[PDB]
Amino acid sequence: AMRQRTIVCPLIQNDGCYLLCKMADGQWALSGGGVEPGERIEEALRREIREELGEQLILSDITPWTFRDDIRIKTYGRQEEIYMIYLIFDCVSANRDICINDEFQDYAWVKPEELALYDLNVATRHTLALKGLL
Amino acid sequence: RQRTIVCPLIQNDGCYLLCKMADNRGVFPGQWALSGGGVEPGERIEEALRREIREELGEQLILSDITPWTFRDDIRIYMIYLIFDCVSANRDICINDEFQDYAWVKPEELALYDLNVATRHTLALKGLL
């Protein structure tokens, strides 16, 4: 009866720079969220983007890239293991118009050569390294 | 409503494994496909993949590498397909319920087989057709 979820995450690129979001108190990460009952995976992705990054952002292309699993121990206040499947999509944005919500404290469009300067969380480092960007 | 399916694109020494579905009858031939298995609650996706392979292709098949490739979705129930690139150390196959025959196929001959829709889309995306 372990908690298990499928998570959709977009790696958003514009004019060669990648979007990173700073989690509210707090590391830098890709955005993303869970797929809810009755939703298709891309529907969940677009919903998460609207919610977290706003309605001004315009995506030109969304393409499934790769997936992996992860196990995390979350502390709500009790501790529980959560098994996740990460579905990572390559996204190209037509613009850079971002409007953040309370899940994020800040955001940045970062050139690949500067990604390593950021205090990224573990999952984000893994994803970027697999893409050959880090 | 929700199902996660794991599928291996298995290759050995330049050839890819295709399996002929037992699913279908009369004059309508069973189509050729990649193996596909469900993931039980609490089961890791790679463990589910290895279980599917053991169940439908036999325990004798040794995998030298299993690497996530890509995913997509489909409907039949809403499915999420998780497709892995795999390399087998050998070509020993022993089939059971899902399949009635198998073949190791050169990439240039894959298109000659009557591939099911999902398999066709997957091989096309891989650049093999």
| Rounded distance between C-alpha atoms, residue B35 and residue B33, angstroms | 6
A64/B72 CB distance under 8 A: yes
> Exposed/middle/buried for A60, CB within 10 Å: 0-12, 13-18, 19+?
exposed
B82/A85 CB distance under 8 A: yes
CB pairs under 8 A between A and B: 40
Of B42, B68, B80, the CB nearest to A68: B68
| Rounded distance between C-alpha atoms, residue A10 and residue A87, angstroms | 9
| Rounded distance between C-alpha atoms, residue A10 and residue A63, angstroms | 9
B45 touches chain A (CB under 8 A): yes
Of B70, B72, B125, which to mutate for an interface test with A (greatest number of A Cβ within 10 Å)? B70
Q: How was this structure determined?
A: X-ray
CA-nearest residue to B43 within chain A is A83
The full set of domains in chain A, from first to last, is 1-134 (3.90.79.10)
- A chain contacts of residue B2, beta-carbon cutoff 8 Å: 37
CA-nearest residue to A38 within chain B is B1
The alpha carbon of residue B29 is apart from the nearest alpha carbon of chain A, in Å, by 32
Resolution to 1 decimal, in Å? 1.8
B42/A68 CB distance under 8 A: no
| Rounded distance between C-alpha atoms, residue A92 and residue A95, angstroms | 9
A87 touches chain B (CB under 8 A): yes
DSSP class of residue A56 equals: S
| Long-range contacts of B69-72, Cβ-Cβ distance < 8 Å, separation of 24 or more | B69/A66, B69/B9, B69/B126, B70/A64, B70/A65, B70/A66, B70/A67, B70/B125, B71/A41, B71/A64, B71/A66, B71/A67, B71/A87, B72/A64, B72/B121
